């Protein structure tokens, strides 16, 4: 009994019983809303930037203030020329500090702005909230949005009315509303917004069926069976396939011409290029975290770092002895890991020409790889006699978990986004779901035909899994079935079929939509 | 507000659906070129034309007939 | 009538 042996061993060992980020974010949110609101929304840019720069100067980080001024001058060089030159103490700064900025706004616009700022409180909205509360005062109004040709402006101009308190207090609405053409409760309003928002959450799931999803398929013709790998860029704009003739081909998924940074190739018209320099079959490719770098490994024992701006190689890594079967960037794109024929996993960093960590412990070749979403653990699997999964620590390079139970070749691995789930598949059509912390198999899915499952993917919220197989099918699985209201497992939501096109890659986009990829063979 | 929403929708989902922009602009133009409508309907139609068609459609469709439209509608309304 | 026909031709 294993428990007795473990207990004996354990007893024998004496085991006792800053502001620029927010500015850019606000600009990117402002140019999103409707054109109606933008006219008033733009008014918040100048005061916030001015106050932030003044605070940075006063805080003693004059370098940051200079960087901010030189960075954003181009965005106001046609409005605040005199003020910008002045910023290059005088009474102007004292007047600015004494009098808080006045900015008219509408009630609905204010509510939308407060909701948005609350949504991103920890991402940088706190800085904007604090700045507006302290150095600014906004006078809310029940009028309509102010535009050069909205109802409010037309009425004011036609009926010859008089300005209001907000209108009274270098662009001013007087120049437009004149013939020559309230306050706020910040902090408390944030509590009210939070209380109202917290009332609209969903905290259960009962009855019903799984989610419906779409799928777009990209097919490749005239390959003749000389394709070994596939990959999509993180934003689904480029696709690369490694062939058995030792070269790589990169396309553009929309057909628009590709661009090169070399002047000699100015505005050349091509929508697919080639990367030559490998001397054997290519088995892995990994687009970087647009993407500007690419990795590749072949059967000659080399890893190459390419460039997607000039389309040429940059470095070669020669730490392997024999074929290399897999390669993978890190979750954020500085570290990458590779495993191959000599039963060892290595972790590189692009700054160094040698492996920074070597990880021993496997007994046969490696056949899969994965990264933990926090970028400090690595998974791997081996074939033949030793069909076990392992979890290494990047800091120390020592195994911390082992998962056993597979009986066939393991073809793919994938780690959930939340970070507490792992999924693996083999050539028998079985998919396993593991609990990382407890090292226990949660459940087995079934339904895929024999032959292999080259790829896997997890939903954005880690509640749906999609797998493409070599039997020309795509299937969607429900990790957790709905609670009952009182050959194939009963948690298969959908199962599509392809017209003689084995699937080599599946990806989950932001929405409930996926993208596939395969090679069409008439025979 | 409806005009702005329609403009944004047309700018966003105009490629997945092939005929959305031509249909919207054609309907708005057909409705606009009708003096029988009241001022509100004409305003809505011109706003829809501008929102859906885009600057090129406006410049190439509305400008040629503005001279006729003036005497057609504005002057009778200007006397009110 | 006279206006309707003119505007219809313009729309055409």
UniProtKB/TrEMBL annotation, chain A:
<keyword id="KW-0648">Protein biosynthesis</keyword>
<protein>
    <submittedName>
        <fullName>Transcription initiation factor TFIID subunit-like protein</fullName>
    </submittedName>
</protein>
<feature type="repeat" description="WD">
    <location>
        <begin position="453"/>
        <end position="480"/>
    </location>
</feature>
<feature type="repeat" description="WD">
    <location>
        <begin position="220"/>
        <end position="254"/>
    </location>
</feature>
<dbReference type="InterPro" id="IPR007582">
    <property type="entry name" value="TFIID_NTD2"/>
</dbReference>
<dbReference type="Pfam" id="PF04494">
    <property type="entry name" value="TFIID_NTD2"/>
</dbReference>
<feature type="repeat" description="WD">
    <location>
        <begin position="317"/>
        <end position="358"/>
    </location>
</feature>
<dbReference type="InterPro" id="IPR019775">
    <property type="entry name" value="WD40_repeat_CS"/>
</dbReference>
<feature type="repeat" description="WD">
    <location>
        <begin position="359"/>
        <end position="402"/>
    </location>
</feature>
<keyword id="KW-0677">Repeat</keyword>
<dbReference type="InterPro" id="IPR020472">
    <property type="entry name" value="WD40_PAC1"/>
</dbReference>
<dbReference type="GO" id="GO:0006367">
    <property type="term" value="P:transcription initiation at RNA polymerase II promoter"/>
</dbReference>
<keyword id="KW-0853">WD repeat</keyword>
<feature type="repeat" description="WD">
    <location>
        <begin position="403"/>
        <end position="444"/>
    </location>
</feature>
<dbReference type="InterPro" id="IPR037264">
    <property type="entry name" value="TFIID_NTD2_sf"/>
</dbReference>
UniProtKB/TrEMBL annotation, chain B:
<protein>
    <recommendedName>
        <fullName>TBP-associated factor 6</fullName>
    </recommendedName>
</protein>
<comment type="similarity">
    <text>Belongs to the TAF6 family.</text>
</comment>
From TrEMBL, chain C:
<protein>
    <recommendedName>
        <fullName>SAGA complex subunit Spt7</fullName>
    </recommendedName>
</protein>
């Amino acid at each position: 009994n294993l428990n007795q042996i473990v207990t004996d061993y354990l007893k024998k060992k004496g085991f006792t019983r800053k502001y620029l980020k927010a500015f850019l974010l606000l600009k990117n949110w402002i140019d999103n809303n409707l054109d109606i609101y933008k006219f008033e929304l733009r008014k918040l840019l100048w005061p916030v930037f001015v106050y932030s720069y003044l605070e940075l100067v006063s805080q003693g980080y004059v370098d940051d203030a200079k960087h901010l001024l030189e960075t954003l001058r181009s965005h106001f060089e046609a409005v605040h020329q005199d003020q910008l030159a002045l910023l290059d103490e005088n009474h102007t700064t004292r007047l600015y500090r004494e009098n808080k900025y006045r900015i008219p706004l509408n009630q609905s616009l204010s509510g939308n702005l407060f909701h948005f700022l609350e949504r991103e409180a920890d991402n940088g909205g706190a800085t904007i909230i604090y700045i507006l509360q302290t150095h600014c005062s906004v006078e809310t109004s029940a009028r309509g949005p102010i535009e050069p040709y909205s109802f409010e402006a037309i009425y004011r101009r036609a009926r010859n009315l008089d300005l209001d308190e907000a209108d009274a207090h270098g662009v001013t609405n007087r120049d437009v509303l004149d013939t020559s053409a309230r306050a706020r409760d910040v902090v408390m309003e944030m509590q009210k917004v939070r209380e109202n928002r917290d009332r609209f959450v969903i905290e259960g799931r009962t009855g019903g069926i799984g989610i419906p999803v779409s799928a777009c398929m990209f097919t490749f013709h005239n390959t003749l069976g000389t394709v070994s790998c596939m990959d999509f860029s993180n934003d689904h704009k480029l696709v690369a396939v490694g062939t058995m003739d030792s070269y790589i081909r990169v396309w553009s998924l929309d057909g628009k011409p590709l661009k090169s940074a070399l002047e000699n190739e100015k505005n050349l018209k091509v929508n697919n290029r080639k990367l030559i320099g490998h001397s054997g079959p290519v088995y892995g490719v990994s687009f970087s975290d647009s993407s500007k770098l690419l990795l590749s490994c072949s059967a000659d024992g080399q890893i190459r770092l390419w460039s997607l701006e000039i389309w040429a190689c940059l470095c070669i890594y020669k730490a392997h002895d024999g074929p290399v079967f897999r390669v993978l960037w890190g979750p954020h794109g500085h570290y990458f890991a590779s495993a191959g024929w000599d039963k060892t996993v290595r972790v590189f960093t692009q700054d160094h020409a040698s492996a920074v960590r070597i990880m021993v412990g496997h007994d046969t070749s490696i056949s899969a790889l994965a990264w933990h979403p926090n970028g400090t653990y690595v998974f791997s699997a081996s074939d033949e006699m030793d069909k076990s999964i392992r979890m290494w620590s990047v800091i120390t390079g020592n195994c911390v978990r082992i998962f056993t139970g597979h009986t066939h070749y393991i073809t793919a691995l994938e780690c959930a986004h939340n970070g507490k789930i792992l999924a693996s598949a083999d050539t028998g059509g079985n998919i396993f779901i593991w609990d990382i912390e407890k090292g226990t198999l949660i459940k087995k899915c079934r339904g895929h035909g024999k032959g292999g499952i080259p790829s896997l993917s997890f939903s954005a919220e880690s509640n749906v899994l999609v797998s493409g197989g070599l039997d020309c099918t795509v299937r969607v699985w429900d990790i957790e079935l709905p609670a009952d209201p009182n050959q194939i497992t009963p948690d298969q939501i959908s199962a599509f079929a392809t017209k003689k096109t084995p699937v080599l890659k599946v990806r989950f986009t932001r929405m409930n939509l996926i993208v596939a990829g395969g090679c069409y063979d008439p025979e | 507000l409806a005009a702005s929403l329609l403009s944004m929708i047309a700018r966003k989902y105009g490629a997945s659906n092939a005929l959305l922009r031509p249909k919207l602009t054609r309907t708005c133009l057909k409705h606009f070129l009708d003096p029988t409508r009241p001022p509100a309907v004409l305003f809505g139609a011109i706003s829809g034309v501008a929102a859906s068609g885009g600057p090129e459609a406006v410049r190439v469709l509305v400008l040629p007939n503005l001279k006729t439209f003036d005497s057609a509608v504005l002057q009778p309304l200007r006397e009110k | 009538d006279h206006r309707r026909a003119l505007f219809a031709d313009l729309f055409r």
